[PDB]
Amino acid sequence: MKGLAMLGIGRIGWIEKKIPECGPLDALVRPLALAPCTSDTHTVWAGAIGDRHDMILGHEAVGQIVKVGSLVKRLKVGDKVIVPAITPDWGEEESQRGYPMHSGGMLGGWKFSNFKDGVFSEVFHVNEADANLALLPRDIKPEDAVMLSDMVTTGFHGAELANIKLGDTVCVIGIGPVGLMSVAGANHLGAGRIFAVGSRKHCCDIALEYGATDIINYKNGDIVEQILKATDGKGVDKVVIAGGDVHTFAQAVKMIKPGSDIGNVNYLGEGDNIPIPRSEWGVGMGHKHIHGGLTPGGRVRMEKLASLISTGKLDTSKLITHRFEGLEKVEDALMLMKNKPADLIKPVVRIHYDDEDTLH
Amino acid sequence: MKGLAMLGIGRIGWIEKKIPECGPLDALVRPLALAPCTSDTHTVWAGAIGDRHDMILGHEAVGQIVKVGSLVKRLKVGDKVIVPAITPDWGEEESQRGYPMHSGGMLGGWKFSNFKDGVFSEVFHVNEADANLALLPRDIKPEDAVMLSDMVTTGFHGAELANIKLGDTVCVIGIGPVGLMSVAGANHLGAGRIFAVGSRKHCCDIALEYGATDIINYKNGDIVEQILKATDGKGVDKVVIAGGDVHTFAQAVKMIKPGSDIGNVNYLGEGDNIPIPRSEWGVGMGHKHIHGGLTPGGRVRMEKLASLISTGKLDTSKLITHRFEGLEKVEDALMLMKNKPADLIKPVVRIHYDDEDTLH
Amino acid sequence: MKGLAMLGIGRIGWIEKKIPECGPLDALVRPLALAPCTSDTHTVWAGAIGDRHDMILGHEAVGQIVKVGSLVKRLKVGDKVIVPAITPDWGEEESQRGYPMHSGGMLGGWKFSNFKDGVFSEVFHVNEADANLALLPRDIKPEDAVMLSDMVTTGFHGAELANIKLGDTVCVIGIGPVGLMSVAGANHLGAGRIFAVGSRKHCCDIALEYGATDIINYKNGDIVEQILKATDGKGVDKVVIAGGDVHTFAQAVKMIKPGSDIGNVNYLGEGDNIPIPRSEWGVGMGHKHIHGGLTPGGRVRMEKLASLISTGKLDTSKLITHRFEGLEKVEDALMLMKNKPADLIKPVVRIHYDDEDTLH
Amino acid sequence: MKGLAMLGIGRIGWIEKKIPECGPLDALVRPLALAPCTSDTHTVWAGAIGDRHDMILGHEAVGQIVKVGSLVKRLKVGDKVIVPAITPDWGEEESQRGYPMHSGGMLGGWKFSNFKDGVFSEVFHVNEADANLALLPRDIKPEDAVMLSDMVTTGFHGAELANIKLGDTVCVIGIGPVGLMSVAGANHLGAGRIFAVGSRKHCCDIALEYGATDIINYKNGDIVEQILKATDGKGVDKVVIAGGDVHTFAQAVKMIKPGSDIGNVNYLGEGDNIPIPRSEWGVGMGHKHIHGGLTPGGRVRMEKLASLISTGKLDTSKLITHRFEGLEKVEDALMLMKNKPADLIKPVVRIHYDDEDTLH
Ligand SMILES: C[As](C)(=O)[O-]
Numbered sequence A, B, C, D: 001m002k003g004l005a006m007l008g009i010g011r012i013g014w015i016e017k018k019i020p021e022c023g024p025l026d027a028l029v030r031p032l033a034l035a036p037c038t039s040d041t042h043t044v045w046a047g048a049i050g051d052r053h054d055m056i057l058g059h060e061a062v063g064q065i066v067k068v069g070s071l072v073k074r075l076k077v078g079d080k081v082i083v084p085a086i087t088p089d090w091g092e093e094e095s096q097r098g099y100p101m102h103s104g105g106m107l108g109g110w111k112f113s114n115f116k117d118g119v120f121s122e123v124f125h126v127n128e129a130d131a132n133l134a135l136l137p138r139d140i141k142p143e144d145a146v147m148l149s150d151m152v153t154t155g156f157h158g159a160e161l162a163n164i165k166l167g168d169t170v171c172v173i174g175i176g177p178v179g180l181m182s183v184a185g186a187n188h189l190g191a192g193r194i195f196a197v198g199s200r201k202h203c204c205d206i207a208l209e210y211g212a213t214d215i216i217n218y219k220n221g222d223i224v225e226q227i228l229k230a231t232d233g234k235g236v237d238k239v240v241i242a243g244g245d246v247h248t249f250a251q252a253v254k255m256i257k258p259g260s261d262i263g264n265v266n267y268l269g270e271g272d273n274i275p276i277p278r279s280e281w282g283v284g285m286g287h288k289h290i291h292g293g294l295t296p297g298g299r300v301r302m303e304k305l306a307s308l309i310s311t312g313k314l315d316t317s318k319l320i321t322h323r324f325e326g327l328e329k330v331e332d333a334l335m336l337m338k339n340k341p342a343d344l345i346k347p348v349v350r351i352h353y354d355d356e357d358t359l360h
């Protein structure tokens, strides 16, 4: 089979691999809808998580089951599924202690395009398929559902980590597709005033559609100073970090009240250390709690989030700026995430099969 | 000064009381908008919290400061304020351990029309005024803000106590004004499917406007059966109880999943015991957590909830069914909470003064 | 193979069952030390969880692996293990949402002697063995370790559900082996004054050894009145219920402060309803949170608790009052739990094999 | 009245100040036992929280009431009290949202020797005295109770912020008196294996007495390496930081598991930034939560912690290494904190009055 792989730091290409073996608890899946992610960009071109050799990329898919292991009970060949980017080993120590996204070791639940061949191939492998795949509800378009795999769940996790409470004033730093979902997540957790820090017109517009109330554009001056002026020197209640670099944490600390939470979901591609400013962190004692977490995954997470789409309470189609057709277009789609044109949020690639509606 | 008082069980009337003494941390307040509460109907006609002698009624007000004590620093004569129903003693033991609504003893933070003269008088007294009074934002009508004092905060507290998470399926039992605000609160905590259990059409339909997705009317059969059928026997993730009686808890237990939360905010006015069904409660072990709590109060609670109105994220005007003018009409309004017509959610009474805009 | 079974409500006896099938993730285990539980007396003689036929009893074992499935990675034939009473299906919906003891439905993680053949047989079956079996540390006696399976974990879980904080005054109601472990759990969560409500003399004496400070014996008068007198009317901070009947909940609510937690781990064997007193529960609003939960299980829970024994911080030997040798003696041991002589806390049965130290 | 003050960065001496004005909620207190703190050495000699003008030092006292305001209800002249280092304004915003130690702004609840005249004077002032002073239990020596003000509460807060669970393996970094209390705090939250990092022999032995199981001395190699050995490369579950410098955080991040908590209570006296290592922090995604908090204070905190002494479950006497008599000797005692001999944990100064037992 064919897949789009990381050949080495700074190098991608199409390669052939064997179809993966399906064990008793596994499923093999063919992609129906795919999206590329900024994270693969860091992994490939920054080498942020080490070198790789012929690792198939991608971790956002809606798919169709082509094979199930003998112990699979919830799924059958032909079923259409939402594939979460994080597919935990549910019995591992870290899962038993409440952190299934770190199953088997830090980031161990994030398999696809971390250290396991990802979803950009004709067939891919899902471990613990019953636990890790949600059936696609009939009222959700595949292109909308592929936003659940990573964008919705990560952006919402940023808001969860920021411990957002009813009526909180919140700042979301970085308004790419993950940040726009942190704006939506903060709004869904009861935030009132929401500052969205970004400068791309189309991203800023979308942030307002998801519940942002204030756009903070760095071209109008230091963003911390803008936030402080807007809040009469008091700062914000909670901060979500969904973009930027290691220096964004100092900005979050400087703009946030004491007794508060900073929720990072940004994958940090470079820099030895994240500098936390001593004085503004209350010289160690300001209760400015700092969180940085990988998204949850698995089927329950997908089902809960899908229910917001099905009930008309979450519209993920706003994230989709480019629509492609055919597996080969994932290469174009991924390059868009590297190049970042002004009109871009997320591309989606749709793939059709001759037996998509009869496969069993 | 005149106030509408409970003169004993089943008896109300206007009485004259001295203007209360204003100590260093206190303020005296005149009403601008007032609303009656079903709780005062329980108190007066059912004797649900014991007999009272000459206690002024009412605990939902927007007001205007007429006097402040010597140590008050945030308020001045003439300021317009949102008065919360619950006005804690912030340094008491219960406050120090995170339960300020029970300051000084169970329900101790609920003073007005519990054991302290309430807001239905020409002037009323607020303890710890800097802590307990929020300024009325210039963009909120007094009639809309009076819903913050008790309806919005209590309804939202039901949703907080039910521990609602992103994508949860929720049932709210009881759809009077508190129940409607529990639906709104559940929706603002990220609920997906929300079942609202009530029968009167103008309440049921307003629930849909606040985020309900399913209306359950007991006239179509047992509401537990209806909810189970709707969820294919799985039940709902979380339940808020915002009305009914002691037997509503058994319904909540029978319709909810194991590993769940039941958040009650209903004031139970009769019955020796609340029966919890042993078998459906997992014979003691189903992790169906049962919570029953008095609303939070004080200035911060009001300020946070008000910000949801100011940002256009909450409309409380839909709760108001009747609009009266003049302090005397609190008597007519309270009598409506007692006679319970089809027309009714909440009356509000507006009171005007010659120097309403010039007092200083 | 021989096992001791519930043949019907009120009837037990030895039966023959086929050696269980061992699937890819499973292990087959032979018992090395076993203990009987009060729960099995409720199940058999009270019919508290419905009728059963031919169900092997028991859910407390230290055992030795005799067979592992083809995908078992952490365990080998011959390994000595602590078997938790609760052996979850870690990928089921409930596990993914943080309640693995309810995997598959309420109480679903409690398999042994609930709806699956338990540990009182020559060989028994463990699902998801890598996830559910802890290796027996070399410095823990099998008889001390068997107290981890259910007594320590359930007792500690009562303390966890009671949300015990540093310096809290706590009451544990019911001082059988589980309650004694709730005393020990409360002490290990930082409780200061601990009241232990019991009347079997030896249980009372042992409670003082595990960190109780005040034995409350009903023969001295109403236990609620005693605790209210001892706390000059203010009540206790938190309450664990580890014994008694449905009416024990009313005692907990009457002795506890508002803004507090009642953690129940008692398996309730009869009564249609648990009555919660309306007035003392703050007429629905006292924030007296009521929790009732099945113990955690799996290997992580066992490993954590076992580390308290290995570090010299928990002595479970004080629980053992009766010692037997030979598999047949589990019948004698279970009959003690039914009859409850004054002498009794917990019996243990030791089983030996010729190749106990050589099996591989 | 005489007091020992910071006269400027690097300078201390005795000055005369006016006996403070006692408002309606205030009390004036004379010292009976006093202790110096490392924090005052950072403040005076490192200028870690800015320059100060004539600020009386000290924030650890057992005292006796000499004057109470007209609205004080729990205290009378002559009463002996435990004075917490932190004395919140309980009605401020931060207190209302659960962070009373930040009342009025970051570190605002820490008044004594932060920005308010401290306890090293003949008389000092306590705001909100009913809320902020605990009566000294008759069974606790003044020298032992003075350890509650700051050492016990801050150390225990370190363990609280580190979110320690039953059976967790914990590392406490820094074993001065606050660190010894973090060890005790961890043991009182149910930790099993506890690693105490320090090299001073007397401190190391005392750590073993408070529940440490392993002592990690840096002279035997990089402490991160030592801890990873002893945990078979998996790391510890939780880390408390109770000493060191800004570089200690990187050590904590490197020794801890993903899905974990680092609880800092150390007052960081120098360095622009705290570097968090990007890779070992899971490239922003490891769920290694970082907390840094000022101790709780007020009466309830002191009463709960004092109950641990009164019940025989905490011995603070082991912290006292030097004993002085007479108010003058607080200068000598603070100088020991600055020069730190091998001999030292905490000095205490006892102050006697002719009417100590007769004042009313
Ligand atoms: C939000 As991700 C799975 O690209 O680190």
Ligand SMILES: C[As](C)(=O)[O-]
Binding pocket: B037, B039, B040, B059, B085, B086, B110, B150, B154, B267, B295
């Ligand atoms: C303050 As109320 C019990 O009427 O919501």
Ligand SMILES: C[As](C)(=O)[O-]
Binding pocket: C037, C039, C040, C059, C085, C086, C110, C150, C154, C267, C295
């Ligand atoms: C496993 As049990 C209900 O006997 O503690």
Ligand SMILES: C[As](C)(=O)[O-]
Binding pocket: D037, D038, D039, D040, D059, D085, D086, D110, D150, D154, D267, D294, D295
């Ligand atoms: C009150 As302190 C910062 O010396 O622990």
Ligand SMILES: [Cl-]
Binding pocket: D058, D059, D060, D061, D062, D083, D084, D085, D112, D119, D149
């Ligand atoms: Cl002090």
Ligand SMILES: [Zn+2]
Binding pocket: A037, A038, A039, A040, A059, A085, A150
């Ligand atoms: Zn991604």
Ligand SMILES: [Zn+2]
Binding pocket: B037, B038, B039, B040, B059, B085, B150
């Ligand atoms: Zn009311």
Ligand SMILES: [Zn+2]
Binding pocket: C037, C038, C039, C040, C059, C085, C150
């Ligand atoms: Zn049992």
Ligand SMILES: [Zn+2]
Binding pocket: D037, D038, D039, D040, D059, D085, D150
């Ligand atoms: Zn100090």
